Design an enzyme around this catalytic site. Structure first.
Site, short mmCIF file in Angstrom:
data_model
loop_
_atom_site.label_atom_id
_atom_site.label_comp_id
_atom_site.label_asym_id
_atom_site.label_seq_id
_atom_site.Cartn_x
_atom_site.Cartn_y
_atom_site.Cartn_z
N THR A 171 -2.79 10.97 0.12
CA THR A 171 -2.33 12.30 -0.39
C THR A 171 -0.94 12.65 0.13
O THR A 171 -0.16 13.28 -0.58
CB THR A 171 -3.31 13.42 -0.01
N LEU A 172 -0.66 12.23 1.37
CA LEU A 172 0.64 12.42 2.02
C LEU A 172 1.47 11.15 2.12
O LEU A 172 2.70 11.24 2.16
CB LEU A 172 0.44 12.99 3.43
CG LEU A 172 1.58 13.71 4.16
CD1 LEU A 172 2.16 14.90 3.38
CD2 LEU A 172 1.11 14.17 5.53
#
Lengths: 232, 230, 231, 246, 245, 212, 208, 227, 204
Positions: free
Chosen positions: B1-2
């Site tokens: 996600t990051l």
């Protein structure tokens, strides 16, 4: 007697009276009739005309390419259901680029029937829909104010539906494996049986949909020709 | 996600006669560590559709639960074989998911391939479906087949051969040089082996312990993994 | 005793039928649609002489190309008219073209049944006779609390609506000229008043095919129409 | 008018819905007895269906029927009343025990759980759109001091401790039985007193009900310091205990 | 005396009449039977009330659904309320697999469904569900596990159950013999004979266009399968031949 | 630290006439310095007498075109007539400005024929501004082709002048322009689709360009 | 941020006598003042006083919040409010905006009543910008000029003291502290509360 | 759906609140005495069967170190009121760093009882709390009702035959009464009220001895007092 | 931090260091060894223990069925036949879900160990982000396990004895402690079997 004040109360016999009254509203509505053969589903209906200055009301509606409906009951509820089905099919073709499965749409509208029958402070729709489509097969579905749906070879809604149903079951065997012209003719005989006081181009509606035949209402000249064929 | 942490390498998908052929190395690299050398990177949604993967593994796993359970919901509201959803449906679904996550700015660090067969006139497997547990091949027209692609940014298209990762330079060049139409299984597997050999000899993140899957009239066939001849 | 959305044994909603009872009283109004345009009128039920009679207006404009004529509970009617003109200008913003009258009456009927949860609290108790011009042609429409909307060549609402429909049925004919339509409207309206027809005692509006613009007739036009009115 | 349909005070100061729910619990005609000694606590109930339109049919797995559930390894319970209400009540008890372990880090005490369920029952009584849960029950356990504990609650939300108690019909007549056997006991090994308590519970249910109590038709459970977990005893061992009582 | 107008009101005798009325509605609706066998389970539904509707297609109306392709779920009552409960069962199975990556156990699923149905019998505003549901599965190790949830919110395990119209005579035929040792394939004869016997609305012609079937046995690799006509029509012909004699 | 914007690259050419409109576009998709596929049409047909072309992010133009087709189909369903090109232009303007602060990476061209048999052509930016024109171009090659269209159509900085123009010469001019762009720009393409609109419906042809 | 509107407060204790003092400056852009009457001392109760030092808007906002809470407490209880209760409530208010706080470093000065006759015990305490309470029992100082005041008080504090000597001590400490700070000064006021009376006096300071 | 079940009748009178007082009058009695150097709350519990233990049920509770409470009515109402009163004392101590005043707690619980009388979809609380405590401003004794109104007493009784118990306690009471004499008057008052025979485990007592913690007497101390 | 897990015959082992009790008992048949941030790991350990107690209560059937110093402790299972103990695949996958939904903050590599009737001894490796892989041979995590990766690869056998895995895992963690700088203290080892779990620590 006193178990018809609300839609959330079962009688001692175990019946929802409000849903039955919505079905009664459907039964007092104007006529409609649908027929299918092997590769065509024909829909017809008697458009209401309250006065000679009044024009015929809209009976048949179009929802999506290769899908359409007919109406019998409260018209505002039909407006709401039509907007919901149109949004559902267009949204499906948006997010997925394919035609929606017809029975999934029928389950969706039946769920909308159910959630309004179930919770209090809300009413069931006083309308039943006569859904016709060609999702790789001709098909005729039905909806009722209770959450429920059934599939038919032929169907009729409200008014003098007994005469139409008698004609349909008298001639149900010949509907399969006949051409489109005789199919339209038989649908007009069923509607003329529902008349019991004459069929004209203005006061009747007619729609056709099938294989390589998107949903399109029949023009005035063709409908006049079929009406003259019925008269002869 | 990051950001990516545990990364897969690349996949190749090509259509041929009797079905399509998709291949992938069974390895997921933790940067420059190569922690896992036996990972299932090609997944199945239903018969006549598979999902590729080259990127972060958590996002592929999340998409695997979403896609396979969408198939479960499809089966739970199924009455005929034609009601089964096509690869176009799933490919559009993944494209919309990637677009929505892009707009939210919470992307998936993956490059997906969805491919299979968008027709039902060739086999009767889907009339009575068998999820848990499980003749001659029937030739399939290329028009009835489908291979798709989904980028981080949601970019998508369709072609007779699609690759991800570093295979978009090596293997795509070999395919554009040599790919014909209606090649048999042996020629297709030779071409896939040559492309994966070139990748193994010039890609750290790749390997030789290859998985090969086919999608034919008989259905999805997870063959035995093999070390490349080299 | 019962809720707003309680069906009757006959399948009719009680509140809707009672709202149909409310529109049976009110100011009479008449509408005529012809090829050259549309006409609306009202009897202008004047109160005592201390009223200005400018504020008490029965013929408002949903847009530049649409008129209306009210009947029943009038505050509810102004609420419907306000929502209608807001939605028509929303169409004019989202789309350059002018909104068709059919879509406007459909939106008005959609608001009218908002009390049924499927926010408002009861039916509006209003009957509208909407008229306008668009690319399809001139037309007029009828609205009532039950949500069904029917499209007309000539109609009437209010108190003396039955006799107005009878005279319109007897007198209206197709392929009519616009002047014939105006004198027909005033003859029917004059026959169904209580008081004698005059200039301040009546109001008229029309939307021509060429202009495609709302235009309420002033005192001079009304007097000109009255002078050439047969008797 | 409508003084007793809802959870409202009647002219005499009697929420009649409370006694209606209590007698509805009694109409299920399932008896359940609890009792405690030293370092043990035994709970017993009948393995039957409640009284309603459906009757026990031949193709009904009678083992699956049970009026004894459990909330936690260390805590057990026996709910008597309507089936859905009892299932909801044990689920709420599981919820409070598990959030108690989460928030406070140690396993809940049965007294605190009984007070919490009594507070939810109070919330049902206070409000009108909440129907009463027709489900009384017992809870047993062992506290941090390594001594037994037994608590009871009604649909009135009245949680109170006990050392011997009964749920269901003939409770007022059955209080004399438990007092008599407890006085007989008052006139021991860690394992022998478990046996004494278990025979006391089975004898109490026999005397209250007045028939043989076939072991397939009943169910017994215990927490003690030897085990400390809620384990329900098998049928053959209960048959051995019944033969000892005979 | 007013105590039967709302589900939230207990009677003076401590009894909810509003659920009894739902039970009476369910008993008068179309019946459903679901029993187990050696190879697996077969479960049927008899749509007797739609004999009047002659225009319905052959076997289109199917009240038997499933979850995860290894659990039969069906009902006897209102179609819409049932379908809502089916969709809730799909939702709970979905939540379980998203949480845990494993198919939901059936004994938990019936408990959650019973709480969902029970959760609507304690509000005046919510209408309680008019549907009695049967859930069942089969696996080679643990054998069949048939349950039945009710409007009251009670789940009990059964080795066989019938609900709806004519249920007393149907069960009177089911306890005629033990079906744990009878195979799934040859029990179709017995079921066809019983529906001909008990129900006083069906005949030879109604038997192949109103009644539904499915099984979850070893022949389908312990997964859901609506039965093909080539298996139904031999046993149907033999059953009506036996009844004619 | 992820930028949700990539120029896939391309060009769309548009030109008008007395009673027709010619719109042409590539059929190449790509990334920064590499090509995905040799066939990715950016032109989407909207109505019987209107089409839309775009350039920029492939996903954004696909979503925008399918959304606009959804709105058009809903408009026909609700209002029982096809929308005019000016109506579609204003609708697309409102759609683009709805995402003002996360704008679509889509430079659009909207071509068609009005009800009075006039070939219109609207050209857009990312945010929503639009203006009718007789010639426009968008995408990577816009700076290349736009002076050429100014020389041909407007034909300023000239004295002899020649306004005698017809459909075939305009089509051939568009083929010359897109070929010059393909020679002189790397993102342009390898096959292009020349959409032509007339009072008698729509026709589409295809042309083969350089593969480099 | 405290250079913008620099200020200082001070408070000492003695033998049945308590003192509080402050500077009267209001700054703007650090190095230019705009007023010479902005008192940091605010009377709040018959025997409780509070000294707020920091940003002027936060000083005023905290004064109205505490006045609201105080006057609510005396009106409901119908009795005079204690110093410890006000101190705890002040600490709770300063903590209630732990993130994005009021940029003010207040103090509390007053008397503690011990009923039995009644004895007035001195009470003094100080706070951070969050409510880091610390009872001190002697001189309490808070503001930008805090270091100079800490230096002065230990040399000049004489334990318990008469109210006149307390006024001389606190006045000299404040004046010597403010002279060595450029952004703090411009007059002073000294409030010396006793149970019998309160003396409020203003000093002839280097206000220039 | 939220509407006030409690409503004004003709002549008002708040009939649900009257029924709540009828519930209180039938419930087991409680009482309290304010002395010169202490305050008492005492109540009789019904003569229990041998299975009940008094070490589980408690009509006497403590809200804080110095504050006690006793009720007469529905037990679950008392439980939720006690828990929320503990929360009120806790939030006041969190704010102002001290033991809560008796008056503030009485005002808040009275406001809560009024809120439950006024709020729709509920019914009033069927009990009557009796809060006692010690603070800076001497000793206090208060009495909550279902109406949500509080009264300051020096000696009071609640429950069955409360008028006769009030009269008897008025007969035997002084403003300067010692704490032991106050306990003796409590015992004699409840003995006259019960119409039976008393002993340990039949009665329960709570007391605050001067500026010290609120204390609940064990059965041994009560047996010492009974002799 | 060093973390090692090894599957041997009829059982499974785990190991850690003691430097900053890294093994945590979720259930009797289920132990988890924590690596990464202390606070993040302890929060998810509290939450996963909450979820385990929830499903362990929920999956219970109704009625009757089945009619240096090597200081060590032994804890026999209360539940024979694994009737109601949850499955380690389930607890590992909900752990994967929890880390994935909060991967922007949560940074902790967890390795799971337990015995199940369905699939016998198992070993699941939850990585940074929501990545879960079932390791049939061995699992590694932490800084100190980086150095013993080839040692474990060399000396691992397919079907190892209890003593073989004991000595191998002990020497593995000892070499990781010797090489790696941020690992030390007494070694903790947990052996999980079909019918019991035994906890033993090594001070060398």
């Amino acid at each position: 007697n006193l178990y018809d004040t609300d839609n959330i109360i079962y009688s001692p016999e175990g019946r929802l009276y409000q849903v039955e009254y919505a079905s009664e509203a459907i039964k007092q509505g104007t006529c409609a009739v649908a027929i299918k053969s092997k590769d065509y589903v024909v829909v017809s209906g008697l458009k209401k005309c309250i006065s000679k200055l009044s024009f015929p009301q809209e009976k048949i509606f179009k929802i999506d390419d290769y899908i359409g409906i007919s109406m019998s009951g409260i018209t505002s509820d039909a407006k709401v259901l039509t907007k919901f089905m149109q949004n559902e099919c267009l949204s499906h073709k948006f997010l997925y680029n394919e035609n929606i499965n017809i029975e999934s749409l029928v389950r969706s509208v039946a769920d909308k029937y159910q959630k309004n029958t179930q919770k209090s402070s809300k009413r069931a729709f006083g309308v039943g829909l006569m859904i016709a489509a060609y999702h790789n097969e001709p098909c005729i579905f039905e909806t009722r104010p209770n959450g429920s749906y059934f599939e038919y070879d032929a169907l009729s809604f409200g008014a003098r539906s007994h005469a139409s149903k008698t004609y349909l079951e008298k001639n149900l065997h010949l509907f399969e494996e006949c051409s489109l012209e005789e199919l339209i003719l038989h649908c007009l005989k069923a509607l003329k049986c529902s008349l019991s006081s004459e069929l004209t181009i203005s006061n009747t509606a007619l729609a056709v949909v099938g294989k390589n035949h998107p949903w399109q209402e029949i023009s005035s000249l063709q409908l006049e020709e079929y009406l003259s064929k019925v008269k002869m | 996600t990051l950001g990516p942490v545990v990364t897969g390498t690349s996949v190749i998908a090509i259509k041929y006669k009797h079905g399509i052929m998709i291949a992938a190395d069974r390895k997921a690299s933790y940067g420059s560590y190569a922690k896992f050398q036996n990972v299932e990177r090609i997944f199945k949604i239903n018969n006549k559709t598979v999902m590729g993967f080259s990127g972060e593994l958590a996002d592929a796993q999340y998409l695997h639960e979403l896609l396979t359970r969408k198939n479960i919901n499809n089966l739970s509201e199924k009455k005929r074989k034609e009601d089964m959803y096509t690869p176009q449906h799933y490919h559009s679904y993944v494209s919309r998911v990637f677009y929505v996550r892009k707009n939210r700015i919470d992307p998936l660090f993956n490059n997906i391939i969805i491919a299979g067969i968008n027709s039902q006139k060739y086999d009767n497997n889907d009339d009575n479906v068998l999820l848990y547990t499980n003749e001659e091949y029937k030739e399939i027209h290329k028009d009835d087949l489908y291979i798709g692609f989904v980028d981080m940014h949601g970019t998508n298209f369709c072609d007779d051969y699609i690759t991800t990762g570093y295979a978009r330079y090596f293997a795509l060049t070999l395919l554009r040089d040599h790919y014909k139409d209606n090649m048999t299984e042996e020629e297709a597997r030779i071409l896939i082996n040559e492309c994966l050999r070139i990748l193994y000899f010039r890609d750290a993140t790749s390997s030789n312990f290859i998985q090969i899957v086919k999608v034919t009239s008989k259905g999805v066939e997870y063959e035995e993994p093999y070390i490349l001849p080299c | 005793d019962r809720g707003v959305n309680t069906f009757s044994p006959e399948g009719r909603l009680f509140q809707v039928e009672y709202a149909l009872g409310a529109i049976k009283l009110g100011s009479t109004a008449v509408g005529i649609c012809v090829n050259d345009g549309v006409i609306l009128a009202s009897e202008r039920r004047i109160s005592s002489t201390l009223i200005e009679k400018d504020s008490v207006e029965k013929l408002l404009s949903i847009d530049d190309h649409i008129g209306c004529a009210m009947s029943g509970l009038m505050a509810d009617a102004r609420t419907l008219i306000d929502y209608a003109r807001v939605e028509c200008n929303h169409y004019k913003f989202i789309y350059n073209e002018n909104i068709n009258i059919k879509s406007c009456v459909e939106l008005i009927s959609e608001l009218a049944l908002d009390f049924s949860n499927l926010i408002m609290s009861r039916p509006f108790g209003v009957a509208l006779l909407i008229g306008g011009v668009d690319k399809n042609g001139p037309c007029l429409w009828y609205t009532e609390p039950s949500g069904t909307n029917t499209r007309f060549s000539a109609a009437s609402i209010g108190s003396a609506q039955e006799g107005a429909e009878l005279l319109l049925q007897e007198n209206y004919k197709k392929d009519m000229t616009f002047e014939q339509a105006e004198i027909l409207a005033l003859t029917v309206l004059r026959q169904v008043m209580e008081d004698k027809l005059s200039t301040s005692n009546v109001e008229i509006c029309a939307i021509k095919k060429s202009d495609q613009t709302f235009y309420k007739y002033n005192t001079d036009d009304i007097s000109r129409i009255i002078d050439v009115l047969p008797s | 008018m409508y003084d007793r349909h809802l959870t409202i005070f009647s002219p005499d100061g009697n929420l009649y819905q409370i006694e209606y729910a209590i007698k509805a619990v009694k109409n299920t005609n399932i008896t359940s007895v609890g009792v405690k000694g030293e370092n043990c606590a035994v709970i017993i109930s009948q393995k039957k269906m409640a009284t309603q339109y459906i009757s026990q049919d031949k193709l009904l797995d009678y083992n699956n029927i049970t009026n004894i559930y459990n909330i936690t390894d260390e805590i057990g319970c026996s709910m008597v009343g309507m089936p859905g209400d009892c299932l909801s009540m044990v689920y709420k008890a599981r919820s409070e025990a598990s959030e108690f372990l989460y928030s406070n880090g140690y396993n809940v005490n049965a007294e605190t759980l009984c007070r919490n369920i009594c507070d939810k029952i109070q919330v049902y009584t206070q409000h009108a759109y909440m129907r009463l849960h027709a489900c009384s029950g017992m809870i047993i356990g062992i506290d941090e001091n390594n001594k037994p504990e037994l608590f009871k609650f009604d649909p009135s939300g009245f949680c109170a401790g006990y050392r011997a108690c009964v749920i269901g019909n003939k409770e007022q007549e059955s209080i004399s039985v438990l007092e008599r056997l407890l006085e007989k006991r008052k006139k021991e090994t860690i394992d022998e007193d478990i046996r004494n308590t278990t025979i006391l519970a089975i004898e109490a249910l026999q005397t209250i009900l007045a028939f043989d109590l076939k072991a397939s038709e009943i169910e017994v459970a215990i927490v003690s310091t030897k085990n400390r977990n809620f384990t329900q005893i098998s049928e053959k061992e209960i048959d051995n205990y019944l033969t000892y009582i005979a | 005396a007013g105590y039967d107008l709302s589900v939230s009101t207990f009677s003076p005798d401590g009894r909810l009449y509003q659920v009894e009325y739902i039970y009476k509605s369910i008993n008068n609706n179309n019946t459903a039977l679901c029993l187990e066998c050696k190879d697996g389970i077969i479960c049927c539904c008899i749509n007797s009330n739609m004999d009047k509707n002659k225009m319905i297609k052959k076997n289109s109306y199917n009240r038997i659904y499933h979850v995860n392709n290894n659990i039969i779920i069906t009902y006897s009552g209102f179609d819409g309320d049932a379908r809502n409960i089916i969709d809730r069962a799909r939702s709970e199975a979905n939540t379980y697999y998203y949480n845990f990556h494993t198919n939901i156990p059936l004994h938990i699923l019936v408990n959650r469904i019973s709480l969902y149905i029970h959760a609507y019998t304690l509000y005046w505003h919510m209408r309680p569900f008019a549907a009695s549901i049967i859930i069942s599965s089969f696996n080679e190790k643990d054998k069949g596990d048939i349950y039945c949830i009710e409007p009251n919110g009670a789940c009990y395990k059964y080795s066989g159950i019938v609900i709806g119209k004519n249920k007393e005579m149907f069960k009177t035929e089911i306890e005629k013999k033990d079906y744990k040792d009878i195979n799934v394939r040859d029990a179709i004869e017995d079921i066809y004979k019983f529906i001909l016997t008990s129900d006083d609305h069906m005949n030879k012609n109604n038997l192949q266009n109103l009644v539904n079937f499915s099984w979850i046995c070893k022949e389908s690799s312990y997964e859901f399968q609506n039965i093909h006509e080539e298996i139904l029509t031999p046993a149907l012909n033999k059953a009506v031949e036996y009844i004619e004699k | 630290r992820w930028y949700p914007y990539i120029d896939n690259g391309g060009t769309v050419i548009g030109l008008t006439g007395k009673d027709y409109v010619i719109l042409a576009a590539d059929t190449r998709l790509s990334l920064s310095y590499s090509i995905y596929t040799r066939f990715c049409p950016k032109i989407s047909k909207l109505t019987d007498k209107c089409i839309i072309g775009s350039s920029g992010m492939q996903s954004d133009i696909k979503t925008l075109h399918s959304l606009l087709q959804k709105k058009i189909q809903l408009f026909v369903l609700e209002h029982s007539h096809y929308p005019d090109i000016h109506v579609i232009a204003r609708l697309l303007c409102v759609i683009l400005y709805s995402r003002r602060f996360f704008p679509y990476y889509a430079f659009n061209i909207l071509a068609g024929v009005d009800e009075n048999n006039k070939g219109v052509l609207y050209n857009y930016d990312s945010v929503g501004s639009y203006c009718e024109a007789t010639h426009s171009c968008v995408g990577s090659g816009s700076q290349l082709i736009l002076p050429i269209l100014d020389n041909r159509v407007e034909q300023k900085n000239q004295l002899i002048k020649n306004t005698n123009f017809n459909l075939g010469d305009d089509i051939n001019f568009v083929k010359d322009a897109i070929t010059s762009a393909t020679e002189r720009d790397i993102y342009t393409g390898d096959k292009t689709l020349i959409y032509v609109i007339d009072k008698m419906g729509i026709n589409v042809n295809t042309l083969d360009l350089k593969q480099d | 941020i405290y250079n913008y509107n620099g200020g200082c407060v001070l408070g000492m204790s003695g033998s049945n006598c308590v003192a509080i003092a402050c500077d009267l400056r209001l700054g703007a852009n650090t190095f230019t003042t705009v007023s010479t009457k902005f008192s940091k001392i605010f009377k709040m109760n018959n025997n409780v006083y509070v000294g707020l030092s920091g940003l002027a808007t936060d000083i005023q906002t905290l004064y109205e919040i505490l006045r609201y809470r105080v006057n609510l407490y005396e009106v409901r209880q119908d009795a005079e409010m204690d110093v410890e209760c006000f101190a705890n409530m002040l600490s709770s208010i300063l903590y209630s905006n732990r993130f994005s706080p009021y940029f003010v470093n207040p103090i509390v000065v007053g008397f503690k009543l011990k009923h039995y006759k009644v004895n007035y015990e001195p009470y003094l305490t100080a706070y951070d910008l969050i409510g880091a309470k610390c009872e001190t029992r002697d001189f309490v100082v808070n503001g930008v000029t805090s270091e100079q005041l800490f230096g002065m008080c230990e040399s000049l504090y004489v334990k318990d003291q008469d109210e006149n000597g307390l006024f001389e001590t606190i006045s000299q400490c404040l004046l010597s502290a403010l002279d060595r700070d450029c952004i703090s000064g411009w007059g002073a006021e000294v409030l010396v509360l006793t149970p019998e009376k309160i003396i409020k006096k203003k000093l002839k300071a280097r206000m220039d | 759906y939220s509407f006030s079940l409690t409503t004004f009748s003709p002549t008002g009178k708040l009939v649900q609140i009257e029924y709540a007082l009828n519930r209180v009058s039938s419930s087991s009695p409680a009482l309290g005495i304010r002395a010169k150097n202490g305050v008492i709350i005492a109540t009789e519990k019904k003569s229990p069967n041998e299975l009940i233990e008094e070490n589980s049920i408690f009509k006497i509770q403590q809200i804080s170190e110095h504050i006690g409470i006793v009720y007469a009515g529905m037990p679950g109402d008392f439980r939720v009121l006690l828990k929320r009163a503990r929360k009120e004392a806790i939030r006041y101590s969190l704010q102002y760093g001290s033991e809560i005043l008796v008056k503030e707690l009485v005002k808040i619980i009275a406001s809560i009882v009024q809120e439950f009388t006024q709020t729709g979809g509920v019914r009033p609380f069927g009990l009557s709390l009796l809060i006692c405590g010690v603070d800076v401003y001497g000793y206090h004794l208060y009495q909550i009702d279902p109406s949500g109104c509080y009264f300051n007493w020096m000696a009071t009784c609640v429950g069955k035959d409360y008028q006769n118990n009030m009269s008897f306690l008025e007969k035997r009471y002084n403003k300067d009464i010692e704490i032991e004499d106050a306990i003796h008057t409590a015992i004699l008052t409840l003995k006259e009220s019960y119409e039976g025979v008393l002993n340990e485990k039949n009665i329960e007592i709570g007391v605050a001895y001067d500026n010290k913690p609120f204390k609940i007497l064990t059965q041994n101390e009560i047996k010492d007092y009974l002799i | 931090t060093t973390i090692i897990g090894i599957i041997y015959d009829n059982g499974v082992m785990l190991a850690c260091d003691s430097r900053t009790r890294k093994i945590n008992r979720i259930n009797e048949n289920l132990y988890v060894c924590r690596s990464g941030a202390s606070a993040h790991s302890q929060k998810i350990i509290e939450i996963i223990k909450h979820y385990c107690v929830s499903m362990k209560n929920e999956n219970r059937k109704k009625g009757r069925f089945h009619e240096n110093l090597v200081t060590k402790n032994k804890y026999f299972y209360e539940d024979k036949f694994n009737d109601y103990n949850p499955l380690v695949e389930n607890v590992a996958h909900i752990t994967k879900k929890i880390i994935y939904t909060n991967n922007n903050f949560l940074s902790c590599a967890l390795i799971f160990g337990g015995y199940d009737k369905i699939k016998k001894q198992q070993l699941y490796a939850v990585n940074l982000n929501g990545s879960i892989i079932e390791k049939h041979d061995f699992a590694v995590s932490g800084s100190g396990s980086i150095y013993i990766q080839s040692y474990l690869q060399d000396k691992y056998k397919k079907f190892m004895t209890k003593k073989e895995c004991f000595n191998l895992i002990l020497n593995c963690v000892k070499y990781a402690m010797h090489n790696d700088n941020s690992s030390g203290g007494l070694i903790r080892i947990v052996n999980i079997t079909k019918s019991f779990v035994e906890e033993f620590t090594v001070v060398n």
